[PDB]
């Protein structure tokens, strides 16, 4: 009664009460209510473990609802209506059913015993970690949210151990097990189910990043260098020579050079490379139309920008229709609003709108020459966004992601240090160079130039002794206190969360792979055609059932049984080590001696 | 059970006379009965007796008699 | 002359305080190219933007490239034509502080962390 | 306050070093217990 | 011994602050007739109390009196 899950289940029965929602009655807690609350505990996934529909609509059984002839919000296939349903034999997950019930009640010692006899070990452990993490977050305010989070981390390590034991032997089947769906859990394939728990440790362990580097670099290899694929990228003949290493090539499956070229282009690595080249060339094109093509009319090289902005903005509309909920149109845009980089992109679009009005109006060319220059770097921030890729830069740019608000902190700090003596530099000396908006130059603009080399010594230099005194004073606090002390709070904070930053980049790596995998390899110059390809398709088609290009690997019964039986044998093998690890721990061996001596005090009083 | 799924198991083979079996009527199958189900019951134990549920292998010697005791010692 | 200087550096895997010190830059070698490609792009990103707002008119054959790009790297280490580089004076202060905020703070001192820590 | 006194009192007994006190003085109860012959 | 009593007080305050922080903060600033009032926050400062003032709810109450009536979430 004092548990949070019981309180949640004491509310769903009231949010859907007897009269208005579960129209016959609903004062009895039945399995559809717990399925509904578990789905809220879970994410936006498929139907949860217990049957929702008219076959087993378990909400409205206290009033004389009709028998088998009804089959609507009642009993259809079960035997009798005796204020119950009948024998729904096992619902194909009898162990996970107890596992969830033990987890929601926060029974730490009980849940581990039930987890041992589980069938789908990894998926169950990952689901338990997510449910524990999200139940800890809701409400008790102390002493059990911490304990729930600790148990969630314990189950995380428990799953990592089983996955490591399964991955050590025959990694090929381990990877296939990683991406399989699980009918007993509302599929939630393990890789997808892991992300919503945010799973810092599980995603960063070995074979996970190996599979991520396997889906990326799709069909070519994992050994070829990055600098050697870019040459074959631009030289189209150079693909056909013996320089790059495919997987079709070792199996000599090259019966059509166009086919192996398609296998080359379908890989996400070259889609990313071609997109980054297109985005790098679009900035050069935009620079072209500002140095020479400064005209008040749409010229030959101007409608290209219009079509480019048309093409890139439609990627977001494609993503809006990618994997939404079929009822929430505004509730899906919230997570787009939750990403400040998406806000930066839409702001760069809005800044383009604000600058185009000045571009088309001939009387405001000068304001349009200074309001679009900042856009060139507002797009450079976005181009920096997509460089969360490199092994030595990704975990390195995640550091400046920690720097971001402190970037503004130090900018506001250092600008004030600069101005504090920029005001005092021109005070004692009698400066007389003044104009309209150019007295400001010789008053303030020449203060920052005197910091990094541009010191007018013949102008800046009786008060020569004080000029030495104050010039040494500024650089004593900046080049000593404001330059070298940053290194301390850079390097120490770098050491602070380096483990976090390493695994955060490991966790954030899947997001880049997710976006670029389910996408055609056509150039953004050629995505314009594919933007209409699914539109002409909907002239003939009417329902969104084109294809599912997700990981989502479905498996047959003959291989599912041949894989789950393999995992169970490895799960018990892993349980050998931890059970042996506990007894080998020196602290635990102190338990063994202590309770054995306690068996001696009672053994020698029989005289 | 306490070995916690340790490698290898203590193999045990049981030898009993085929005559003194309670529910052997369901065990007889004209074809190869690789699948089979035997349910034990300690209620209807007359001169007969039930089998053990822990032996890994079973050998049933028959001699034509029904209630004979000791048709397994010499074999 | 410098391709042979790399070879002459090769044979200085000798000194007690340089051998284990040049083995560190042997770890640096591919990341030398990493940071070269990184820093050249940071330099060019604002080398393009420096000559945009101001109206520069010095152009020749293979010397317009000079006053367009070659003078951008010289303005990093001391050679700043203040009488040429300096109405848009407020923004010239703004962007010049912005570049050195990410380079002299984020791209200079953060290298020390991934130098010293990897050294340890 | 008494609830807090539970943890520190339990913290002292859970410390591995203190558990060395428990065994040491229990063995000292064995030297005097086996001289009654 | 002064540091030991400091840790002793920090433990009691942490145990009282974990449950229903609202009354814990109210207990923090109350006067005590049995000690010449010296309310706890004021009495702590003159001991210079490096560790007690830096523990959690103390700085939470300091961030509560500052930002007086608006909030603790706004930027």
Short mmCIF file of C-alpha atoms in Angstrom, two decimals, chain A residues 229-556:
data_model
loop_
_atom_site.label_atom_id
_atom_site.label_comp_id
_atom_site.label_asym_id
_atom_site.label_seq_id
_atom_site.Cartn_x
_atom_site.Cartn_y
_atom_site.Cartn_z
CA UNK A 229 38.18 6.09 -48.86
CA UNK A 230 37.83 9.80 -49.68
CA UNK A 231 40.08 9.47 -52.75
CA UNK A 232 37.90 6.69 -54.15
CA UNK A 233 34.90 8.86 -53.25
CA UNK A 234 35.74 11.61 -55.75
CA UNK A 235 37.48 9.45 -58.37
CA UNK A 236 34.61 7.28 -59.60
CA UNK A 237 36.87 5.00 -61.71
CA UNK A 238 39.02 4.53 -58.59
CA UNK A 239 36.29 2.45 -56.95
CA UNK A 240 36.81 -0.35 -59.48
CA UNK A 241 40.55 -0.78 -58.83
CA UNK A 242 42.19 -2.93 -56.16
CA UNK A 243 42.59 -0.28 -53.46
CA UNK A 244 39.54 -0.38 -51.17
CA UNK A 245 38.35 -3.50 -49.31
CA UNK A 246 34.71 -4.57 -49.63
CA UNK A 247 32.91 -7.58 -48.22
CA UNK A 248 31.62 -8.44 -51.69
CA UNK A 249 35.25 -8.42 -52.86
CA UNK A 250 36.64 -11.21 -50.64
CA UNK A 251 33.65 -13.38 -51.59
CA UNK A 252 34.35 -12.25 -55.20
CA UNK A 253 30.63 -11.45 -55.52
CA UNK A 254 31.40 -8.67 -58.03
CA UNK A 255 29.21 -9.66 -60.97
CA UNK A 256 28.06 -6.10 -61.64
CA UNK A 257 30.29 -3.07 -60.93
CA UNK A 258 27.14 -0.98 -60.61
CA UNK A 259 25.89 -3.42 -57.96
CA UNK A 260 29.04 -3.18 -55.83
CA UNK A 261 28.94 0.59 -56.32
CA UNK A 262 25.37 0.55 -54.96
CA UNK A 263 26.60 -1.56 -52.05
CA UNK A 264 29.32 1.06 -51.57
CA UNK A 265 26.94 4.03 -51.69
CA UNK A 266 24.24 2.51 -49.46
CA UNK A 267 26.66 2.49 -46.50
CA UNK A 268 26.04 5.39 -44.07
CA UNK A 269 29.72 6.44 -44.14
CA UNK A 270 29.61 7.61 -47.76
CA UNK A 271 26.16 9.17 -47.33
CA UNK A 272 27.68 11.21 -44.49
CA UNK A 273 30.74 12.03 -46.61
CA UNK A 274 28.66 13.21 -49.56
CA UNK A 275 26.35 15.23 -47.30
CA UNK A 276 29.33 16.88 -45.59
CA UNK A 277 30.85 17.67 -49.00
CA UNK A 278 27.55 19.17 -50.21
CA UNK A 279 27.23 21.27 -47.05
CA UNK A 280 30.88 22.35 -47.35
CA UNK A 281 30.34 23.41 -50.98
CA UNK A 282 27.06 25.22 -50.23
CA UNK A 283 28.99 27.67 -48.03
CA UNK A 284 31.47 28.26 -50.87
CA UNK A 285 28.52 28.88 -53.20
CA UNK A 286 27.06 31.38 -50.71
CA UNK A 287 30.45 33.10 -50.45
CA UNK A 288 30.52 33.30 -54.26
CA UNK A 289 27.34 35.40 -54.36
CA UNK A 290 28.59 37.98 -51.85
CA UNK A 291 32.01 39.02 -53.20
CA UNK A 292 31.22 39.43 -56.92
CA UNK A 293 27.49 38.72 -57.33
CA UNK A 294 26.32 41.56 -55.03
CA UNK A 295 23.30 42.41 -57.17
CA UNK A 296 19.76 43.47 -56.21
CA UNK A 297 18.24 40.94 -58.62
CA UNK A 298 18.02 37.12 -58.54
CA UNK A 299 20.90 36.23 -60.84
CA UNK A 300 21.96 33.00 -62.55
CA UNK A 301 23.60 31.70 -59.35
CA UNK A 302 20.80 32.78 -56.98
CA UNK A 303 17.87 30.36 -57.43
CA UNK A 304 20.29 27.61 -56.40
CA UNK A 305 20.15 28.99 -52.85
CA UNK A 306 16.33 29.00 -52.96
CA UNK A 307 16.18 25.37 -54.08
CA UNK A 308 18.88 24.43 -51.53
CA UNK A 309 16.84 25.92 -48.67
CA UNK A 310 13.76 24.17 -50.08
CA UNK A 311 15.59 20.82 -50.08
CA UNK A 312 17.17 21.02 -46.62
CA UNK A 313 14.03 22.29 -44.86
CA UNK A 314 12.11 19.27 -46.21
CA UNK A 315 14.42 16.88 -44.35
CA UNK A 316 12.76 18.04 -41.13
CA UNK A 317 9.31 17.41 -42.62
CA UNK A 318 10.47 13.91 -43.59
CA UNK A 319 11.67 13.31 -40.02
CA UNK A 320 8.31 14.57 -38.72
CA UNK A 321 6.64 11.72 -40.64
CA UNK A 322 9.46 9.25 -39.86
CA UNK A 323 8.35 7.63 -36.57
CA UNK A 324 5.59 9.71 -34.95
CA UNK A 325 2.63 8.77 -32.80
CA UNK A 326 -0.48 8.48 -34.96
CA UNK A 327 -2.44 10.91 -32.76
CA UNK A 328 0.12 13.43 -31.52
CA UNK A 329 1.23 16.02 -34.05
CA UNK A 330 2.17 18.77 -31.57
CA UNK A 331 3.48 16.39 -28.88
CA UNK A 332 6.17 15.15 -31.28
CA UNK A 333 7.40 18.66 -32.12
CA UNK A 334 8.16 19.15 -28.41
CA UNK A 335 11.27 16.95 -28.59
CA UNK A 336 12.37 18.95 -31.63
CA UNK A 337 11.87 22.04 -29.47
CA UNK A 338 13.80 20.20 -26.72
CA UNK A 339 16.93 20.18 -28.93
CA UNK A 340 18.67 23.55 -28.89
CA UNK A 341 20.55 22.58 -32.07
CA UNK A 342 17.23 22.17 -33.89
CA UNK A 343 16.40 25.61 -32.47
CA UNK A 344 19.69 26.88 -33.93
CA UNK A 345 18.78 25.41 -37.33
CA UNK A 346 15.31 26.98 -37.33
CA UNK A 347 16.83 30.27 -36.15
CA UNK A 348 19.30 30.15 -39.04
CA UNK A 349 16.26 29.66 -41.28
CA UNK A 350 14.56 32.65 -39.62
CA UNK A 351 17.73 34.74 -39.98
CA UNK A 352 17.77 33.81 -43.67
CA UNK A 353 14.15 34.97 -43.91
CA UNK A 354 15.08 38.25 -42.18
CA UNK A 355 18.06 38.77 -44.49
CA UNK A 356 16.29 37.86 -47.73
CA UNK A 357 13.80 40.70 -47.25
CA UNK A 358 16.81 43.04 -47.15
CA UNK A 359 18.36 41.21 -50.13
CA UNK A 360 15.33 41.69 -52.40
CA UNK A 361 14.72 45.32 -51.37
CA UNK A 362 17.18 47.52 -53.32
CA UNK A 363 17.26 50.35 -50.75
CA UNK A 364 18.76 48.25 -47.93
CA UNK A 365 21.72 46.52 -49.58
CA UNK A 366 24.20 47.90 -47.02
CA UNK A 367 22.21 46.48 -44.06
CA UNK A 368 21.94 43.25 -46.05
CA UNK A 369 25.73 43.18 -46.41
CA UNK A 370 26.22 43.12 -42.63
CA UNK A 371 23.21 41.06 -41.46
CA UNK A 372 23.99 38.01 -43.62
CA UNK A 373 27.69 37.84 -42.73
CA UNK A 374 26.79 36.48 -39.28
CA UNK A 375 24.70 33.79 -41.01
CA UNK A 376 27.90 32.40 -42.53
CA UNK A 377 29.04 31.50 -39.00
CA UNK A 378 25.62 30.69 -37.61
CA UNK A 379 25.78 27.94 -40.24
CA UNK A 380 29.36 27.20 -39.14
CA UNK A 381 28.01 26.34 -35.68
CA UNK A 382 25.68 23.84 -37.37
CA UNK A 383 28.62 22.48 -39.39
CA UNK A 384 30.46 22.02 -36.08
CA UNK A 385 27.39 20.15 -34.80
CA UNK A 386 27.82 17.39 -37.39
CA UNK A 387 31.47 16.90 -36.36
CA UNK A 388 30.52 14.75 -33.39
CA UNK A 389 32.14 11.91 -35.30
CA UNK A 390 35.90 11.59 -34.82
CA UNK A 391 37.40 9.37 -32.13
CA UNK A 392 39.78 12.11 -30.94
CA UNK A 393 37.32 14.98 -31.56
CA UNK A 394 33.94 13.56 -30.51
CA UNK A 395 34.93 13.05 -26.87
CA UNK A 396 36.90 16.29 -27.34
CA UNK A 397 33.98 18.37 -28.68
CA UNK A 398 31.76 16.93 -25.93
CA UNK A 399 34.13 18.83 -23.62
CA UNK A 400 33.30 22.14 -25.31
CA UNK A 401 29.66 21.09 -25.01
CA UNK A 402 30.34 21.43 -21.27
CA UNK A 403 32.01 24.75 -22.13
CA UNK A 404 28.98 26.26 -23.86
CA UNK A 405 27.37 28.39 -21.15
CA UNK A 406 30.78 28.98 -19.64
CA UNK A 407 31.80 30.21 -23.11
CA UNK A 408 29.37 33.07 -22.51
CA UNK A 409 30.58 33.29 -18.90
CA UNK A 410 34.19 33.85 -19.95
CA UNK A 411 33.18 36.08 -22.88
CA UNK A 412 31.28 38.41 -20.54
CA UNK A 413 34.20 38.16 -18.09
CA UNK A 414 37.01 38.93 -20.55
CA UNK A 415 35.11 41.67 -22.38
CA UNK A 416 34.72 43.46 -19.04
CA UNK A 417 38.42 43.01 -18.21
CA UNK A 418 39.28 44.46 -21.64
CA UNK A 419 36.92 47.44 -21.33
CA UNK A 420 38.04 48.23 -17.77
CA UNK A 421 41.43 49.36 -19.07
CA UNK A 422 40.29 50.29 -22.57
CA UNK A 423 38.54 53.18 -20.85
CA UNK A 424 41.64 53.99 -18.78
CA UNK A 425 44.11 53.84 -21.68
CA UNK A 426 42.82 56.96 -23.46
CA UNK A 427 42.22 58.93 -20.25
CA UNK A 428 45.67 60.26 -19.31
CA UNK A 429 46.96 60.71 -22.86
CA UNK A 430 45.38 63.49 -24.92
CA UNK A 431 43.96 61.78 -28.00
CA UNK A 432 42.41 63.97 -30.69
CA UNK A 433 41.46 61.58 -33.52
CA UNK A 434 37.66 61.77 -33.73
CA UNK A 435 35.02 61.31 -36.43
CA UNK A 436 31.47 59.99 -36.78
CA UNK A 437 31.54 56.35 -35.61
CA UNK A 438 35.33 56.55 -35.91
CA UNK A 439 36.07 58.35 -32.66
CA UNK A 440 34.66 55.13 -31.22
CA UNK A 441 37.38 53.41 -33.26
CA UNK A 442 40.31 55.30 -31.74
CA UNK A 443 38.64 55.13 -28.31
CA UNK A 444 37.62 51.46 -27.93
CA UNK A 445 38.47 49.50 -31.09
CA UNK A 446 42.19 50.23 -30.63
CA UNK A 447 42.10 48.81 -27.08
CA UNK A 448 41.54 45.19 -28.12
CA UNK A 449 44.05 45.57 -30.97
CA UNK A 450 46.70 46.57 -28.40
CA UNK A 451 46.22 43.16 -26.75
CA UNK A 452 47.25 40.83 -29.56
CA UNK A 453 49.95 42.86 -31.33
CA UNK A 454 48.57 46.07 -32.86
CA UNK A 455 50.03 48.55 -30.37
CA UNK A 456 50.56 52.05 -31.86
CA UNK A 457 53.77 52.71 -29.93
CA UNK A 458 54.31 56.03 -31.71
CA UNK A 459 50.83 57.10 -30.54
CA UNK A 460 50.39 55.25 -27.23
CA UNK A 461 53.88 56.33 -26.15
CA UNK A 462 55.77 62.64 -19.25
CA UNK A 463 53.45 59.86 -17.96
CA UNK A 464 55.74 57.16 -19.36
CA UNK A 465 56.45 55.65 -15.93
CA UNK A 466 52.73 55.10 -15.25
CA UNK A 467 52.21 53.74 -18.77
CA UNK A 468 54.73 51.03 -17.87
CA UNK A 469 53.06 50.55 -14.48
CA UNK A 470 49.48 50.02 -15.68
CA UNK A 471 50.44 48.03 -18.79
CA UNK A 472 52.23 45.54 -16.53
CA UNK A 473 49.23 45.52 -14.19
CA UNK A 474 46.70 44.44 -16.83
CA UNK A 475 48.84 41.61 -18.18
CA UNK A 476 49.64 40.50 -14.63
CA UNK A 477 45.98 39.59 -14.07
CA UNK A 478 45.19 38.43 -17.63
CA UNK A 479 48.25 36.57 -18.93
CA UNK A 480 48.95 35.11 -15.46
CA UNK A 481 45.63 34.96 -13.61
CA UNK A 482 43.18 34.79 -16.51
CA UNK A 483 45.25 32.66 -18.90
CA UNK A 484 46.96 29.99 -16.78
CA UNK A 485 44.16 29.58 -14.22
CA UNK A 486 41.81 28.59 -17.04
CA UNK A 487 44.16 25.65 -17.69
CA UNK A 488 43.55 24.40 -14.15
CA UNK A 489 39.76 24.54 -14.44
CA UNK A 490 40.05 23.14 -17.96
CA UNK A 491 42.37 20.21 -17.25
CA UNK A 492 40.94 19.28 -13.84
CA UNK A 493 37.36 19.39 -15.11
CA UNK A 494 38.57 17.40 -18.12
CA UNK A 495 39.80 14.70 -15.73
CA UNK A 496 36.57 15.01 -13.71
CA UNK A 497 34.02 13.75 -16.25
CA UNK A 498 36.38 12.16 -18.80
CA UNK A 499 34.82 8.75 -18.15
CA UNK A 500 31.38 10.35 -18.46
CA UNK A 501 32.37 12.26 -21.59
CA UNK A 502 33.80 9.10 -23.16
CA UNK A 503 30.61 7.09 -22.62
CA UNK A 504 28.36 10.06 -23.43
CA UNK A 505 29.94 10.24 -26.88
CA UNK A 506 29.53 6.46 -27.02
CA UNK A 507 25.85 6.93 -26.17
CA UNK A 508 25.41 9.88 -28.55
CA UNK A 509 27.04 7.91 -31.37
CA UNK A 510 23.88 5.91 -32.15
CA UNK A 511 21.91 9.10 -32.85
CA UNK A 512 24.12 9.99 -35.83
CA UNK A 513 23.85 6.41 -37.12
CA UNK A 514 20.06 6.40 -36.66
CA UNK A 515 19.54 9.52 -38.80
CA UNK A 516 21.82 8.51 -41.68
CA UNK A 517 20.90 4.82 -41.96
CA UNK A 518 17.22 5.18 -42.87
CA UNK A 519 17.96 7.57 -45.73
CA UNK A 520 18.65 7.17 -49.47
CA UNK A 521 22.19 7.72 -50.73
CA UNK A 522 21.08 10.40 -53.20
CA UNK A 523 22.93 13.73 -53.10
CA UNK A 524 21.13 16.64 -51.44
CA UNK A 525 21.23 18.07 -54.97
CA UNK A 526 19.34 14.87 -55.88
CA UNK A 527 17.21 14.47 -52.73
CA UNK A 528 14.80 16.87 -54.44
CA UNK A 529 13.66 13.93 -56.58
CA UNK A 530 13.31 11.59 -53.59
CA UNK A 531 11.29 14.24 -51.73
CA UNK A 532 8.62 13.75 -54.41
CA UNK A 533 9.13 9.99 -54.76
CA UNK A 534 7.09 9.25 -51.63
CA UNK A 535 4.53 11.88 -52.70
CA UNK A 536 3.78 10.35 -56.11
CA UNK A 537 3.70 7.02 -54.27
CA UNK A 538 0.83 8.34 -52.12
CA UNK A 539 -1.06 9.21 -55.30
CA UNK A 540 -1.43 5.44 -55.79
CA UNK A 541 -1.02 4.29 -52.18
CA UNK A 542 -3.20 5.51 -49.31
CA UNK A 543 -1.81 4.04 -46.06
CA UNK A 544 1.67 4.46 -44.54
CA UNK A 545 2.88 0.90 -45.14
CA UNK A 546 5.78 1.43 -47.55
CA UNK A 547 8.70 -0.14 -45.66
CA UNK A 548 10.41 -0.35 -42.26
CA UNK A 549 14.11 0.46 -42.71
CA UNK A 550 14.95 0.16 -39.01
CA UNK A 551 17.24 -2.32 -37.27
CA UNK A 552 14.21 -4.25 -35.97
CA UNK A 553 15.51 -7.66 -37.06
CA UNK A 554 12.67 -10.19 -36.91
CA UNK A 555 13.59 -13.84 -36.36
CA UNK A 556 12.00 -17.22 -37.12
#
